[PDB]
Design a protein around this nucleic acid. Sequence first.
DNA 1: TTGTGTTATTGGCGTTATTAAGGTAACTTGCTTAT
DNA 2: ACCTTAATAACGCCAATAACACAA
DNA 3: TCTGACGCGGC
DNA 4: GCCGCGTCAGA
Lengths: 196, 53, 49, 201, 202, 87, 50, 470
Amino acid sequence: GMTPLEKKQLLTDEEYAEALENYGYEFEASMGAEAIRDLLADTDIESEIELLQAECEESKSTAKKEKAIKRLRLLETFQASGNKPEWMVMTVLPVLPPDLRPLVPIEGGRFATSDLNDLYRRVINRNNRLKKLLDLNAPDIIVRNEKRMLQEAVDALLDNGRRGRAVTGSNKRPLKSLADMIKGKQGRFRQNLLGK
Amino acid sequence: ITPKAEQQLTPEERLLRAIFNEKASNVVDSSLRMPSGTSGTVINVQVFENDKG
Amino acid sequence: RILEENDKLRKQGKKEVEYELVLMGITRSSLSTESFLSAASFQETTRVL
Amino acid sequence: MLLYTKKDDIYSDIVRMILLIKGANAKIVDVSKEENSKHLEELNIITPNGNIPTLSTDDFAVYRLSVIIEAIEDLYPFPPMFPVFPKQRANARILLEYVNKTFLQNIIKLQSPDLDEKQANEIKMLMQRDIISTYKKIVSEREVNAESNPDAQNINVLTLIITFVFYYFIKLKISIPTKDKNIIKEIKELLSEPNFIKTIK
Amino acid sequence: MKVTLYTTKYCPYSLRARIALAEKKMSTDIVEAGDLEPAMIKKITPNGVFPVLMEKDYSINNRKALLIYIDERFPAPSLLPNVVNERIKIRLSLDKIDNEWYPVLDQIRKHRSDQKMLESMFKDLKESLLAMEKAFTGSEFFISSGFTLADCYIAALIICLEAEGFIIDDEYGAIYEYKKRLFARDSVKKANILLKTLRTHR
Amino acid sequence: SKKFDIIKISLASPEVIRSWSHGEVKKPETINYRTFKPERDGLFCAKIFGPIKDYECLCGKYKRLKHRGVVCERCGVEVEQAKVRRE
Amino acid sequence: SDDIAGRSKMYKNIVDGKLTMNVDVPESFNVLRNEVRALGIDMDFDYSSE
Amino acid sequence: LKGKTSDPIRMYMREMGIVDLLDKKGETDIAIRIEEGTTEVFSTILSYPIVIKTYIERFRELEEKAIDYMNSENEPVARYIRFNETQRAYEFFTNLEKMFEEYQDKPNKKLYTKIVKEFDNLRLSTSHLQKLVDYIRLPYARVKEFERKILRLCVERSKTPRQEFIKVYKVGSLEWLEPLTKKYKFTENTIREIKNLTKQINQFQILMMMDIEELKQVNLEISRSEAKITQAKKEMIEANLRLVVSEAKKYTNRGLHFLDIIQEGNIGLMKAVDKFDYRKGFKFSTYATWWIRQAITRSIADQARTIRVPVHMIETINKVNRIKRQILQEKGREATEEEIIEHTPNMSKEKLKKILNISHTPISMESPIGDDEDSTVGDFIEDKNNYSPIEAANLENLREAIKELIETGLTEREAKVLMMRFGIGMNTDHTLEEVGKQFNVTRERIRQIEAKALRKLKHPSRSAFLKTFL
DNA sequence: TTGTGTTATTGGCGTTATTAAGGTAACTTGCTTAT
DNA sequence: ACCTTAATAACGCCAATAACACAA
DNA sequence: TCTGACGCGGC
DNA sequence: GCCGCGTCAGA
Ligand SMILES: [Zn+2]
């Protein structure tokens, strides 16, 4: 917008309110994954590649442009492959065939779930409650809380323990997330591909 | 013995039932047998019945 | 050693390459390979994938 | 249960093979034979355009070899000429129609006496061109049909169809533009089918 | 599981498939083939024969066995007769309807450009229908005891030809005992258009 | 070639992820409690992922060799080998 | 270990007594391609002409 | 402060206890605010003609669905239309119908006031009110559908102007696209389509009233009033977020963690605020805890398990549990099911034999086993529904056996008959009347042929060898 | 080889036991769970 | 923790119909 | 425990 | 342009 602000300019709530006061429309500063996704979306490459390669043609990489070297490679790769860079923010995530997370019944008239069933059963009803809320037009605070709880469950499903205090079941064990199956000595590569 | 169902048996199984008049039993046995490589005798047989009956 | 030889006679030699060997550890030279499958099996799977 | 035929016609001899498969009451009758002018007239009474072949029962008469073969199959549960899986059935149908339109129509055309030079030439060119693709797709279809059920003693009709296409290709002095040893050896082995001998003689 | 059908507007076989699918007591996504991106439209099928299908692992287009594949893939109450001889006759009837029907719609659509040409065709259409009136009477929908596929076949020549200024029920001779018995079917009553409006157009 | 001879990795667009999906999951259900059959459209929905037995829908109606590629209509179950519940 | 076809195939070849082997691909690798595909990553077989 | 702390519960509690707790004065003030907002939107709704005729029409639909009952001694009961107004309802409706007829014929001011006052007599809380506001909205929705559609149909073809909108946008005309002969959009099919759509547009208006500006402003005023009410209710609900967290301290480990507990609470609260009228002098805090508790316990009973379980089966279980504890801590002994039933509203003696058979949440496959040779349960479950390479080798040894056994039987016939009538490499396993046609004869002695084949096959020359496979 | 007797199924019917939904108006307002 | 109600899917019914059998 | 590769903040 | 203090990744 014509407003003198900067695109990647973090604004606190009250400073944002003052921007709204003095300029009203002509600029949007949203919060949440939609914000990041919109940014990555409206991020032209050819506007940026050469503009940065020229700052690197101003090579004084003693401490400053020892940083700008990688962004070259990243932006070149994203051009070379053909991948939309906004794809790094999911909008629909897939599920795994059931016979890779079975629920077979075993002795004692009991069953043996897999830890993935639980994380799935959580992300699902959190998405459901979110849709119901967005429907009923609730206040934005609980909208925020749901939209954040959802991100938390998704991260737990992918690999819990990367950022928080990874969730546990009744037995109080840190659950065996998705990524936690294809790493480690007990994982999938050096356990059942070179094991057998 | 334990019961079962859902045969819908193969055509050949059907034929061979139909030759010797072989009926298809709905039950299957799961007994208790000493595993191979063992022998011996018996010294005590504890049996616990049902409740409230 | 391949791209140098690509230029070496195709165009003219087109001023191919000047380099200098560098010494890196065994783990460092292990993960730094080409095949992403073997590297991904070795260790630090998340990062390489 | 009668089938009017006419020698020198790929359609009639195709349905003849299909019948001899069942060996059913092939009460065969020709058309161009002067010993049955009356019954030729009869056919002309029971059909608009006197198309050959034509299957007649005490219930109806039919034409358009697609309908003919499908009615035969509706009629005889003899070792069959079709898959069991709806998708494979539909694919067989479509491929049959394709090879039909693209080859048998031209064959009927160059069966004419009033032909031209350029016409026969270009037609034989296209046939020599597309035979290879037809054969390849057909053997592929055969394989994939068979994997889903083995030892089924069921005959794939499209193989017979391509057999008769090749046989007429021979019977009209044209070249088959291949160089594969596999192609030609399987061709010849195919032509040597026992119950297939029953008619070509 | 899921299955959708891509269709265009004002096509005989498109409506044919629509009615058949509606009959099978099923549920499908209906997408009008005109609302997609042109490059996307063509990338669907690079040739383009709009009424096709969409299943998870298959895509069928050729409008000769399509209805057959429908009749076979969901054997929910059939669209083909149970008794074999009827099964044989009806397919040849389908051949009659198919092999020679181009001038009935295509020519009156494109080649008949003079109103004189159109009406000169119309007289022949009327007289051909009259010549056809000396045929089936009282039959349920066709030569049959119950509902068949040809029933779902003539509905296209009904609707699309009604859309060509050819309303003919009593100005059609004596084919009216079923041509009105036809539209007493739920599925065929998808041809064209207060509380009823809000309730129905959803 | 009949044998693949390279392997490549890449990001999945939301249009590839749908292309992989044989359905969609809507309610957090796994298996009925009293009888142990799968539930309608949960995390074991036999209509999406596949049947349970071989050549047999869930409601057990379409159970005969006459109909193999057939799709039942009481339950949305297909009819095919259970070996697809893993792919 | 884990070639579903090959298991029964070889156990058949033995009891009969002929020579043949079919070794298409193991199962654990398909399981891996699934588990990685259950993320936004697209691992897949392919062909190359360059 | 906003200091990188990740766990959301704090990032929610912080904002939660920000705005101040209020007193009965403020509560009743915002309550009368929402009430007058609702009465504004209500009154401003029914000042349009077609509203009441559509109301009467829906009553006619209920009339026919009521006549559909004696086909199977009162007016057939269905009052899902109005809440807390059937003889009075029906009679009032009759008056409504007739007086509305006279209204649509003669008058200008009086009888309109009469009908709005008899509506003032009625009582509808939020359901039917929204039913009416949609009665108004949905028509505008559909006409806007058709507008967007005609745009998308023409604008990306008709020279792609996209900025000469003011000239084309004149709606309900069908007089603009004819100059388009001397303009773009060679769109004959599209021409008849947009003419069909504009026909339906004018037809909808005819059903309702004059042009779009007859409804646009109605919807605008409705949006405004509704935004007032929404802000009022939002201020109301934001004042007592702490009540939720306070009550949600008891249910804390029964199966759900805390956040979703809180969310279910907030749902049950937001649903509570709009059905609580100040008309009675009371405390919002008293009545709202009912709804909070309902929501929390319902969600708990819903998603506290993997294998879902109906809610009645769960409250009965809770009842059994309380009884069991009461007796254990009273008489020492444990179960004595005779006593469990000897004083119980369960009113059954077999459900108990099942109500507690589902009393084991599934163990998780990834529980190590302490020492126990250092393994886990997730490697003792095994494949049970397949055919082990022996279970699938004793089959082809039979699948091919009889395929040869028969090859030493009939010349060809009984082979054909057994194949067709049993199904071997066939597709259907045909029936007697099918083979009956296969050979053109023998509708009956085909059965005789199969009987002969079978009596010929049960000879120790061919029988006892196969007898193993059974 | 053609007549007269079953039968096995199979859509229709009702029946109801089981599941899902909704509603109470004396006043009630912020854990952090632990080498 | 307790109701008070519609709504749904399993379960029992006896006829129809397509198929099978059994004496000359 | 460590040993480091790699940081990314005070000055 | 650097002296200390972090996280991650394997033991
Ligand atoms: Zn089913």
